[PDB]
Structure 1
Amino acid sequence: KGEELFTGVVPILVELDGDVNGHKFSVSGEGEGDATYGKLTLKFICTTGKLPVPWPTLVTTLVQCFSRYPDHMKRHDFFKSAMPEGYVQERTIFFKDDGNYKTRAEVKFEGDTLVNRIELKGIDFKEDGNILGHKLEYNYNDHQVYIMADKQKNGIKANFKIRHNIEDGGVQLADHYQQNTPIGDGPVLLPDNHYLFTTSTLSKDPNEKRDHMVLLEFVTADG
């Protein structure tokens, strides 16, 4: 069972290759996750220079298998059971009155490391808008995610809004549409619909000279 792979502390690697309006960049993340409590600690670096979008806009893209699933719902855990073979995660994210991200990721085990490997393509952004103009506050407003059985494939889907506070006032909406499918061909758990609740905290490493994001997350699933 894939759930057995999460009983202790699991190292995490995140690799993102991005291209937003032709501005190409890479992000790496490293840390660990504890699905017993639902805690994630990760540090991300823009390894190509200055990040061409704001860090908060990448949080959802940069591993819901680490959610704390309570006892009575363990057999509704699609994300962990897909392991070690893993799952594909696809999203489209529409930024209101601005461009959009299209992301494809594979989440799987490589050795004992849970790896999230992402391709991101952004198009139709305004160069002086809130994203390419870096006009968003360095913080986060988390939102619940209603995970529904992709009753029609075998997998899951969800859609939800994320709100990014704008420095000069107001809020930038990021409308998320998500589909996940197992990579393997073994049997999938196909959960009953349920919520994921997340609390994310962004900070900085005072000793890090590169463009970076320190991220601490707590995540649980609810009936």
Structure 2
Amino acid sequence: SKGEELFTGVVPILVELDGDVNGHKFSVSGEGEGDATYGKLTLKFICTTGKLPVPWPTLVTTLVQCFSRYPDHMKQHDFFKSAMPEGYVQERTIFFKDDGNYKTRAEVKFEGDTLVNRIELKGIDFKEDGNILGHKLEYNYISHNVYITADKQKNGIKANFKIRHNIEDGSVQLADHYQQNTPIGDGPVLLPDNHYLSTQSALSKDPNEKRDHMVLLEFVTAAG
């Protein structure tokens, strides 16, 4: 089980995101640690360019599934850890219903003992007065699952899932995700049988942090 050993204890994480939505540029940096044994992620993200032009909840999925807890009987289906330390490229298109879309390209890999997630995000066709640019989304999270399937044609995995972002009027802003992950090394990786990753999220704020930011606590477990 190559790559698994790199996740046996607590691992420091660094996230770097460069975005541009409807021409509005922004950057986000994140730091924290992951404990894959418990499928636990603890991270704090900061918008280093000022005010985030989009809702923090809409960036959660974009901002390291290698930290998921895979039950012992499912260890042969952990594509994410198997690609380490070289890593994998993670790409998505996220369609916000009745609004614009995000296109993301990220590289997740180890740089020394730090697991790094470096992201490029481009958003187009958003409504200036819509739920995203207008910041009309509640600061929380309710979606949990994603069905992961193998993508042999690309020697990786893929997934399609909907994320629901609660709005104050009781309605929901849908964010339809289409995902594809491919290894960075020419090395071996595990192409998994179908399964789910179920994530419990928790968004919060550091009462003593003045910069625009997001504190995130997540627990992810594989099943199915």
Question: Which TM bucket (shorter chain)?
Answer: over 0.9
TM-aligned CA deviation for residue 143 of structure 1:
2.6
TM-aligned CA deviation for residue 73 of structure 1:
1.3
Cα distance in 2 for residues equivalent to 1:86 and 1:206: 35
Residues 204 and 214 in structure 1, CA contact (< 8 A), matched pair in contact too: yes
TM-aligned CA deviation for residue 40 of structure 1:
0.3
> Structure 1-normalised TM-score?
0.99
Cα distance in 2 for residues equivalent to 1:14 and 1:111: 14
Cα distance in 2 for residues equivalent to 1:71 and 1:168: 43
Q: Equivalent residue of 2:120, what SS?
A: strand
> Structure 2-normalised TM-score?
0.98
Task: State how many pairs are aligned.
Answer: 223
Q: Deviations 1:30-64 (Å, cap 9, x if unpaired)?
A: 00000000000000000000000000000000000
Cα distance in 1 for residues equivalent to 2:161 and 2:185: 27
Cα distance in 2 for residues equivalent to 1:54 and 1:187: 38
Cα distance in 1 for residues equivalent to 2:143 and 2:153: 28
Question: Which residue in 2 is equivalent to 1:195?
Answer: 196
Residues 138 and 202 in structure 1, CA contact (< 8 A), matched pair in contact too: yes
CA RMSD for the aligned pairs?
Answer: 0.7
Residues 38 and 220 in structure 1, CA contact (< 8 A), matched pair in contact too: yes
TM-aligned CA deviation for residue 86 of structure 1:
0.0
Cα distance in 2 for residues equivalent to 1:50 and 1:93: 22
Deviates more, 1:163-172 or 1:112-121: 163-172
Residues 135 and 168 in structure 1, CA contact (< 8 A), matched pair in contact too: no
Query: Which ranges of 4 or more aligned residues in structure 1 deviate by more than 3 Å?
Result: none
1:67 and 2:68 aligned? yes
Q: Deviations 1:144-184 (Å, cap 9, x if unpaired)?
A: 11110103221000000000011233110000000000000
TM-aligned CA deviation for residue 87 of structure 1:
0.2
Cα distance in 2 for residues equivalent to 1:168 and 1:135: 10
Cα distance in 1 for residues equivalent to 2:185 and 2:12: 22
> Could you list the runs of 5+ residues in structure 1 that have no partner in the other structure?
none
Cα distance in 2 for residues equivalent to 1:52 and 1:186: 39
